[PDB]
Design a protein around this ligand. Structure first.
Ligand SMILES: [Zn+2]
Ligand SMILES: [Zn+2]
Ligand SMILES: [Zn+2]
Ligand SMILES: [Zn+2]
Ligand SMILES: [Zn+2]
Ligand SMILES: [Zn+2]
Lengths: 76, 4, 1737, 150
């Protein structure tokens, strides 16, 4: 499977992933490509964040689907 | 015995 | 004999001594206090021994500070105060020595070891009989607790307790003591009699002095002040002196103008006033005293304090009259009385001291005699003074001589110093038949025979002691008597006999109620099966219960014809009433918990007293709906009601527990008697009645307008008692004439109120009412809602003759009766627009009544009942989604999770555990597949969730695929299996005509109004009704009521409807009922269908047979969104029309600027560089197969590596570059720093938010037809001059810009060495050398980190893109520096080789990098020279071992034990012998030592080879032809040719690749030409093993359960005052030193400042299961979950909570090691903290 | 002023590559104020809610974070009753790398993961933590109120 990631800068990077890979592996690949550590990355798909413990299959993420990249945040 |  | 007289004389003659006579200031008072302390200890310790000859048995005869005599010579040698005042005496009694290992051995005796502060408590849940039994370290044997939930808790200073070892009743199973696993002078009659006499005289003197200490009594003190004021204003001093003398302590030994003298003023600490108020009161008292505000207040925090003292009584009157200024408890006390009471305080301190004497034989006598004297009758009470006449003479107004309670009300004794009569109450058998609406009539006696012991007097005087003395007396008495099994029953009896006096003292007459001894008395005494049995076997339990009831009964009023408790509204700034209530309820619950015979609490007197206690809170809290203005402030009145009703609910659940566990069953007669009593009390309520029809009568009450309560304890207990017996017996046990609706209507009211507030009908009230409703639901202590449903089911069931009367009353309370009877239309019900939700809740309530038949079921045992309850709660809490253990525990009610074993077993039966998949996620539990058929979404357990969502979720797990999600039907779970015979007819009220009319009207309104809110629940209810009728009435039956009223016509209207109305869920369910309905009675139903619809629909229905509303709302919402998006598009187009369309920097993308980019980086030391040691087969022998963990090996590091870690934090040549590689323009970086008020020396990455303290400029590397192929680098020339050709030709502007930025970076970076800059010869061109050294260190760090992976021969290559990018950036920065500024001169050497200090542990690779960068010769020659020199040096150093005969044999034996030794070929041996030949070995041959040398050399060369390969790869990535390309050397792929090689063929292939020789044989054959570079002289030997954190234990529980058998290096800090028994320690992961926490210096930063690596570290916390990551330069730390995974899969603090077994996870600890080895811990800490770190910068 | 230039870049990014479920556009009079809309994420109580926002940019937006507020009434634990939003992305620790689309995506993702601790709307957080049914009912109420603008 091939998925796309749009960083904060606006450029789109291409990730070659597996439907059974967790979000942590995707974050590690994003760190390798861009440099943002998995501590800071938040992956937004369909307007909602992606939980680290879950896998890519649990969010119905398929080929050519775009997951947005945002730095970690919390409410005030 | 013990007990924004 | 005559010693008693001397003791009495010296104790009563303290005040007459010339030194003690006069008053003194605060500065001279401390010396007097020390003198009194020393005098008392010396005299009492001399006397307590036989003529002073037994002191060496207890104390050290030859201590330090001797030079002088240690022990007193005789009686006069100890009473002589002159030596004490001359400082010629020594503190001999001290035992603070190293020999005190607190080793104790007991067999049969109770340990009684009071817990020292910081010691752990070992509460085994599966072994303790309750939650109070504990154990100390010396007793806890882990061998008895295999697979036990042993919760370990840390003792606090504010909490106290004793070990319970040896108590065969306090533990469910015997526990062999760990100590037991591992001539006499104090026993003879003379010494035991002597110690008994000493203790007896001590206690007699204490009681005598404090019997006359009525001055600080709360009842008299205000009267004291009033009398003194009256006698002072009128000036009658003659009577004042007599009064003061009468109040004064008097003795016959004290002596053998008119105003008195030598009087002081003493204030007593209290919680009335804040410390500021105490200070202002003190300043109002004595303004001219210096430091009175703070120094005196500090003493007030430690008991009591004095503020004035003078011989002139007139001078001290002003201070005594400062009481009324603020109300502080100040009393006027004579100096002699103060001296005597301070002396008694010091004597109590002495008694506490002797309990810590290590002499075991002394303790078994001292404690026994202390128990004997304390529990002995207080003789000499008649002989001693009586203080009753004084208050008789001076306070006759408050002393009614005809009142039997005149003594206790004033907290004084009786005539003859006897314990006075208390407010005893006896409930006569003539007043136990029924529960009176008010307090039941009781008999008050006027004659009691108290034992009148010394212990009783001391406990009675508890309101007269101060805080410190009260604590000392409690700690010296209660643990001592409780531990002693001989005097524990006597202690319990004597505290029960005086229980009423103690309770009244705490309630009405006390100063510090929280300090009273009754709490500890009930904790250590009443929590015992034997003491509870003794209490229950007498009327003492009734006395205690009524004493507690008397406290509650004084705040009740009359409401509804019954006595009801109320919130306290009087003046209780003392706060005593709250403690009184809590203590009484806790005592009642604790006593009921330990009842031996469960029949006892149900006995008439006992049950009436308990019901009287529980009655005051039945309906205590009343709430009314707020109509009108919104609530301004949330009402906090409900807190106390909730707390005390929670206590009562816990009492009832405890009654259930004791009924369940006890084997002796409770006879049904007592159950029926209790049912009769409670039902008779509850049915006597007066309720208004109304008749809607002339033939039916129902209770009239509107929940929306009147006061209604949630908590109804009496109805709950009634439901419990009805459950405990059969239905026929429960009905016959009721009153002769009864109306069950009277008693069940309150429970139905609670249900209706909860449903009304659920739907939002009470939003005009505050959130407090919502909290109350949420507490009533899922009540932690009890199933209140389920019991209300049970009561309503009972009311329905016991009306078999008048069923439709019940339906009207049930439907009346819901306020639906106006709608149902036609008095008002659907839309205009009192609920207004909320009628749909209310009817939804009503349908849920009806279905719960019909279906919830758990209470009428009969199980095999109460264990099965409890297990089924647990399993049902778990099933209904798990089906929504998989849940972690902690979340599931939180959701399930507390009364179900009190037993961990049963909950765990039920969870294992119900769910399947899913292991965690991340590195920090909790393992979740998943509901089984076959258990989804047992879930009913409308049942009571599913109350919180909605119906449609839960229905869809359950149907998802029942359909085999996504097609039949909305096509499957949810069967209602109505069953009659194992059900009571009389309870089968719960479906009678469903089949009645009135309920059929209700159902028909509900379907009709659903159709008419097109409202589907409650239609799904309604169809489920109808399905349940049909299922129940089929179950009861037999096969294919149907209620005739649903036939006469044609709802089948309405079902067709629902089924035969368009998709726009209703949903598939409803239509499929409606169609399902018709097929269910029609197949039973086809002919009788089609007639009714054609009676209205005719033949058109009926024939169409069969033709239709046998062959989403979200989308519609989705369509509308998406159309609206499309319109808004079109508006946005038009706005954007107009804006664009308005302006005519008028290596990348993170801040300004595509800026096209010519300024050069910079890279933020972290530049600091690394703790991975540590020297290795030759002749150590633990390093070079074991081939490393990735990460490991020695669970069985203690983390005892060797000394030299610790020094290496210490030096790594300060040596400047051992730093490493770590960067995120986020390019920024230099001017952009300067602006970002300046606006953010940062500095180039320390900042955070803008795009990355990582801590950075170094910026490295870069340049664009281009391979623009310049050759520079990797083969040219290998074989021709690799010096950095050729490397600099990758840079594009520059301009003078570029030169000046780069020069300026490099100058600024040199002058601003703190990463670069200050010592190197210090050297005068050092120039700005020489910084390139230190940069190259740091880059080599970074390469070494990458190489060392790569050792943790499985394929070490190729790991450094794989999955390290960012690390290699950082390395390439460092190399580019070095090339730019050496190309702009220029190549430096080789003369300078920043780190010259010193004979004693080693600068770099990787000096060989340092020289390799230096030669590759600066020396013009190619890399192959440099690496060949370095490897040859290092191999020859290593061979020379190893082959000169100490002994060639035995030491080498031991080394070879260890090598064979650890790993595999390599055979040496004949030519290989020839080469080694050429390098160095030794023939002095006495072995069979030199082959053994040469094999050892060869294998050690082979594994020593591996790190340098790997670093060289990393260097090759970074060079290749520098000059790669394409953006992505493979690495090929000599025509071969390196990864392919190296991935599958052993440790020797790998070395040979690598030598082929990087050197000029084909193998190690060829490399060694090369000549021995000398080398000029100093780096090759005495090359250090780096650690060739795996560098990682310490080897943590397999189970985290070992560090706390077995903290003493775990061998670990101890931090030199603390490690004193028996720190071995404390668990307040952290384990350092870097070095393994057990660091004890002093709670000081920024979370124990001292271990990082000294004795370990300074810049950062990681400490494991065994008790909290957390790892704290510390960063030094900015003081900061964070907490992360330890790499430990609990059995249930919990992580973090939840893992060690509840004592579950915690196990190490290798993947998580490997992740921690990978975080540590790389310098990511500072960046990790900076990122996690976020803004908190920013403020620190 | 460089602030307006980066705002023009933000507009160019949002015109052609706006994130899904998010739209934004400044007033053609001046770029200093923006109107943005966050469509409620699916499988969320806020689903289909066309929640509107008004973005206020300072004259030094590259460094000073914008003032983000909700115009359509919102019932969220971390959203003030005023309409102000507490986000660590906003206020302190705001990074100069945040495109407007990134801020809008952050706020959109905040909907499904509120922070009950440190509440901005105490009633909203209390209902979210203990009273899920009432919370989701009120969220549906505010969604229906949001649809009414059109
Ligand atoms: Zn146990
Ligand atoms: Zn023991
Ligand atoms: Zn013990
Ligand atoms: Zn820039
Ligand atoms: Zn960064
Ligand atoms: Zn350490």
């Amino acid at each position: 499977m091939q998925i796309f990631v749009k960083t904060l800068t606006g450029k789109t990077i291409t990730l070659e992933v597996e439907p059974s890979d967790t979000i942590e592996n995707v974050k590690a690949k994003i760190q390798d490509k861009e440099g943002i550590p998995p501590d800071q990355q938040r992956l937004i798909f369909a307007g909602k964040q992606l939980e680290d413990g879950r896998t890519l299959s649990d969010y119905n993420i398929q080929k050519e689907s775009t997951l947005h990249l945002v730095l970690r945040l919390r409410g005030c | 015995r013990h007990g924004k | 004999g005559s010693l008693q007289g001397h003791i009495r004389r010296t104790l009563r003659s303290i005040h007459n001594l010339p030194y003690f006579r006069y008053t003194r200031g605060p500065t001279e008072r401390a010396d007097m206090s020390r003198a009194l302390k020393e005098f008392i200890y010396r005299y009492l310790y001399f006397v307590i021994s036989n003529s002073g000859e037994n002191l060496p048995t207890l104390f050290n005869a030859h201590p330090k500070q001797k030079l002088l005599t240690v022990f007193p010579d005789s009686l006069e040698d100890a009473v002589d105060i002159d030596k004490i005042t001359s400082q010629q005496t020594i503190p001999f009694y001290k035992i603070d020595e190293s020999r005190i290992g607190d080793v104790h051995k007991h067999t049969g005796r109770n340990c009684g070891r009071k817990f020292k502060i910081g010691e752990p408590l070992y509460r085994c849940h599966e072994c303790g009989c309750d939650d109070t039994c504990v154990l100390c370290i010396h007793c806890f044997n882990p061998k008895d607790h295999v697979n036990h939930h042993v919760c370990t808790d840390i003792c606090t200073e504010f909490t106290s307790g004793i070990c319970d070892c040896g108590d065969e009743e306090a533990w469910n199973s015997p526990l062999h003591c760990k100590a037991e696993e591992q001539e006499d002078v104090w026993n003879d009659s003379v010494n035991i009699a002597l110690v008994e006499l000493v203790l007896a005289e001590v206690f007699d003197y204490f009681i005598d002095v404090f019997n006359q200490n009525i001055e600080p009594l709360p009842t008299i003190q205000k009267d004291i002040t009033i009398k003194l004021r009256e006698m002072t204003q009128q000036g009658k001093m003659y009577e004042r002196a007599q009064f003061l003398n009468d109040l004064k302590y008097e003795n016959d030994y004290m002596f053998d103008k008119i105003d008195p003298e030598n009087y002081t003023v003493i204030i007593y600490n209290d919680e009335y006033h804040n410390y500021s108020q105490a200070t202002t009161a003190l300043r109002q008292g004595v303004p001219d005293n210096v430091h009175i505000d703070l120094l005196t207040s500090r003493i007030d925090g430690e008991g009591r304090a004095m503020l004035k003292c003078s011989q002139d009584l007139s001078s001290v009157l002003g201070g005594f009259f400062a009481v009324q200024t603020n109300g502080l408890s100040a009393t006027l006390t004579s100096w002699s009385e103060y001296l005597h009471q301070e002396t008694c305080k010091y004597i109590i301190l002495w008694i506490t001291h002797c309990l810590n004497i290590p002499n075991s034989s002394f303790q078994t006598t001292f404690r026994n005699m202390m128990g004997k004297t304390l529990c002995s009758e207080y003789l000499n009470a008649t002989e001693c003074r009586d203080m009753t006449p004084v208050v008789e003479k001076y306070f006759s107004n408050k002393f009614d001589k005809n009142d039997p309670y005149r003594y206790i009300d004033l907290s004084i004794l009786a005539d003859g110093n006897q314990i006075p009569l208390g407010h005893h109450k006896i409930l006569p058998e003539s007043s136990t038949h029924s529960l009176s609406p008010l307090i039941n009539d009781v008999e008050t006696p006027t004659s009691r025979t108290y034992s009148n012991t010394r212990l009783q007097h001391i406990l009675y005087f508890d309101n007269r002691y101060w805080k410190r003395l009260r604590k000392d007396i409690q700690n010296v008495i209660i643990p001592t008597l409780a531990s002693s099994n001989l005097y524990k029953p006597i202690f319990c009896q004597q505290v029960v006999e005086i229980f009423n006096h103690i309770t009244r003292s705490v309630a009405y007459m006390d100063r510090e109620p929280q300090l009273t001894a009754i709490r500890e008395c009930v904790v250590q005494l009443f929590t015992c099966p034997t003491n509870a049995k003794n209490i229950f076997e007498n009327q003492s339990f009734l006395d205690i219960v009524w004493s507690i009831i008397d406290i509650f009964k004084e705040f009740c009023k009359v409401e509804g014809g019954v006595l009801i408790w109320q919130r306290v509204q009087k003046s209780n700034l003392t706060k005593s009433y709250s403690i009184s209530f809590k203590q009484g309820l806790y005592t009642v619950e604790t006593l009921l918990s330990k009842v031996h015979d469960p029949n006892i609490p149900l006995r008439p007197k006992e049950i009436i007293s308990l019901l009287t206690l529980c009655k005051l809170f039945n309906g205590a809290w009343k709430i009314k709906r707020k109509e009108g203005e919104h609530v301004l402030h949330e009402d906090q009145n409900f807190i106390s009601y909730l707390e005390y009703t929670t206590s009562i609910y816990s009492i009832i659940q405890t009654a259930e527990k004791v009924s369940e566990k006890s084997k002796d069953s409770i006879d049904s007669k007592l159950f029926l008697n209790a049912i009769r009593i409670i039902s008779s009390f509850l049915g006597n309520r007066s309720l208004t009645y109304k008749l809607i029809y002339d033939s039916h009568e129902v209770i009239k009450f509107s929940v929306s307008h009147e006061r209604v309560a949630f908590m109804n304890p009496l109805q709950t207990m009634l439901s419990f008692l009805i459950e405990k017996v059969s239905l026929k017996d429960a009905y016959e046990a009721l009153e002769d004439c009864s109306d069950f609706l009277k008693i069940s209507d309150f429970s139905l009211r609670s249900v209706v109120l909860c449903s009304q507030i659920d739907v939002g009908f009470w939003v005009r009230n505050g959130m407090s009412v919502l909290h109350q409703a949420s507490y009533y639901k899922n009540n932690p202590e009890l199933g209140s809602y389920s019991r209300d449903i049970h009561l309503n089911q009972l009311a329905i069931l016991w009306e078999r003759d008048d069923i439709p009367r019940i339906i009207y009353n049930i439907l009346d309370r819901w306020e639906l009766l106006d709608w149902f009877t036609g008095e008002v239309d659907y839309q205009h019900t009192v609920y207004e627009d909320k009628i749909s939700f209310i009817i939804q809740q009503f349908i849920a309530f009806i279905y719960q009544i019909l279906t919830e038949r758990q209470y009428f079921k009969t199980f095999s045992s109460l264990k099965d009942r409890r297990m089924d309850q647990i399993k049902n709660s778990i099933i209904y809490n798990l089906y929504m989604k998989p849940l972690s253990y902690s979340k599931l525990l939180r959701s399930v009610p507390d009364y179900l999770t009190e037993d961990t074993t049963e909950f765990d077993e039920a969870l294992e039966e119900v769910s399947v555990f899913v292991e965690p998949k991340g590195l920090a996620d909790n393992g979740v539990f998943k509901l089984k597949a076959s258990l989804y058929a047992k879930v009913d979404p409308l049942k009571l357990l599913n109350l919180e969730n909605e119906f449609e969502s839960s229905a869809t979720i359950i149907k998802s797990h029942l359909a085999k695929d996504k097609d039949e999600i909305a096509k499957v039907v949810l069967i209602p779970q109505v069953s009659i299996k194992q059900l009571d015979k009389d309870a089968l007819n719960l479906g009678a009220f469903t089949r009645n005509t009135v309920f059929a009319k209700v159902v028909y009207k509900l379907l009709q309104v659903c159709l008419d109004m097109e409202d589907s809110t409650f239609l799904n629940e309604l169809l489920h209810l109808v399905h349940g009704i049909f299922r129940d009728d089929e179950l009861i009435n037999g096969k294919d039956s149907i209620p005739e009521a649903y036939l006469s009223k044609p709802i089948c016509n309405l079902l067709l209207s629902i089924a035969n409807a368009k998709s726009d109305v209703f949903s598939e869920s409803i239509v499929r369910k409606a169609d399902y009922l018709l097929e269910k309905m029609i197949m039973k009675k086809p002919n009788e139903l089609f007639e009714s269908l054609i009676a209205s619809f005719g033949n058109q629909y009926v024939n169409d229905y069969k033709d239709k047979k046998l062959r989403t509303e979200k989308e519609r709302k989705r369509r509308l919402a998406k159309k609206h969104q499309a319109r808004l998006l079109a508006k946005f598009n038009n706005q954007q187009t107009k804006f664009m029309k308005e302006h005519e369309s008028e290596f990348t920097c993170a801040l300004c993308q595509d800026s096209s600027s010519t300024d050069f980019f910079v890279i933020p980086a972290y530049h600091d030391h690394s703790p991975i560089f540590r020297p290795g040691n030759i002749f150590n087969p633990n390093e070079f022998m074991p081939m490393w197969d990735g990460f490991y963990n020695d669970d069985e090996k203690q983390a005892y590091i060797d000394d030299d590596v610790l020094e290496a870690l210490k030096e790594n934090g300060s040596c400047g040549s051992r730093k490493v570059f770590v960067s995120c590689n986020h390019h920024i323009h230099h001017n952009c970086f300067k602006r970002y720093v300046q606006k953010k008020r940062f500095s180039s020396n320390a900042f955070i990455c803008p795009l990355c938010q990582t801590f950075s303290n170094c910026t490295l400029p870069l340049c664009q590397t281009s391979k623009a037809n310049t050759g520079l192929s990797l083969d040219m680098f290998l074989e021709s020339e690799l010096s950095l001059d050729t490397l600099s050709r990758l840079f594009k030709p520059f301009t003078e502007e570029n030169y000046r810009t780069i020069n300026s930025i490099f100058s600024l970076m040199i002058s601003q970076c703190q990463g670069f060495d200050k010592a190197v800059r210090k050297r005068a010869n050092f120039s700005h061109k020489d910084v390139s050398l230190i940069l190259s050294v740091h880059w080599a260190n970074t390469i070494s760090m990458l190489e060392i980190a790569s050792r943790l992976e499985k394929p070490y021969s190729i790991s450094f290559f794989r999955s390290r893109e960012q690390k290699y990018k950082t390395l390439k950036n460092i190399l580019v920065c070095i090339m730019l520096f050496t190309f702009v500024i220029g190549k430096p001169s080789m003369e300078f050497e920043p780190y010259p080789q010193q004979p004693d200090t080693v600068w770099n542990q990787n000096q060989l690779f340092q020289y390799i990098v230096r030669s590759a960068l600066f020396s013009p010769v190619s890399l192959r020659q440099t690496v060949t020279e370095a490897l040859t020199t290092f191999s020859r040096q290593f061979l020379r150093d190893f082959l000169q071992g100490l002994s060639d005969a035995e030491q080498v044999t031991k080394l070879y034996a260890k090598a064979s034990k650890i790993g595999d030794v390599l055979k040496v070929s004949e030519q290989m041996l020839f080469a080694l012998r050429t390098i160095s030949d030794v023939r002095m070995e006495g072995l069979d041959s030199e082959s053994i030592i040469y094999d050892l040398a060869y294998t050690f050399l082979l594994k020593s060369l591996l790190p340098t080879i790997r670093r060289c390969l990393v260097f090759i790869k970074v060079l290749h990535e520098l000059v790669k032809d394409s953006e992505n390309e493979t690495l090929v050397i000599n025509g071969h792929e390196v990864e392919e040719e190296l991935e599958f090689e052993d440790t020797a063929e790998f070395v040979n292939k690598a030598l082929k690749m990087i050197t000029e020789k084909e193998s190690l044989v060829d490399l060694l054959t090369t000549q021995e030409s000398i080398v000029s570079h100093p780096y090759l002289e005495n090359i250090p030997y780096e650690y060739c093993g795996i560098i990682k954190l310490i080897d943590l234990s397999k189970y985290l529980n070992t560090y706390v359960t077995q903290s003493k058998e775990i061998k670990l290096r101890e931090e030199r800090s603390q490690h004193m005052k028996n720190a071995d028994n404390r668990l307040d320690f952290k384990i350092c992961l870097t070095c393994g030193v057990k660091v004890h926490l002093r709670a000081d210096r920024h979370e124990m930063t001292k271990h990082l400042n000294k004795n370990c690596f300074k810049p950062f570290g990681a400490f494991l916390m065994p008790n909290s299961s957390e790892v704290c990551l510390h960063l030094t330069q900015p003081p900061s730390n964070i907490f992360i979950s330890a790499p430990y995974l609990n059995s249930h899969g919990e992580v973090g603090r939840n893992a060690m909570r509840r004592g579950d077994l915690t196990t190490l996870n290798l993947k998580r600890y490997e992740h921690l090691n990978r975080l540590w080895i790389n310098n990511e811990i500072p960046g990790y800490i900076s990122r996690v903290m976020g803004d908190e770190f920013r403020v620190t910068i | 002023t460089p602030a307006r230039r980066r705002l023009m870049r933000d507009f160019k990014r949002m015109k052609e590559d706006a994130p899904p479920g998010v739209s934004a556009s400044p007033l053609p009079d001046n770029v200093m104020v923006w109107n943005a809309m966050i469509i409620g994420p699916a499988d969320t109580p806020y689903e289909d809610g066309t929640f509107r926002l008004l973005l206020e940019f300072d004259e030094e937006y590259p460094n000073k974070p914008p003032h983000v507020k909700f115009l359509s009434e919102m019932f969220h634990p971390n959203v003030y009753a005023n309409g102000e939003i507490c986000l660590d992305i906003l206020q302190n620790r705001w990074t100069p790398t945040y495109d407007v689309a990134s801020i809008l995506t952050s706020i959109q993702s905040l909907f499904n993961d509120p922070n009950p601790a440190s509440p901005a709307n105490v009633e909203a957080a209390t209902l979210f933590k203990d009273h899920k049914s009432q919370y989701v009912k009120r969220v549906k109420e505010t969604v229906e109120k949001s649809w009414e603008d059109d």
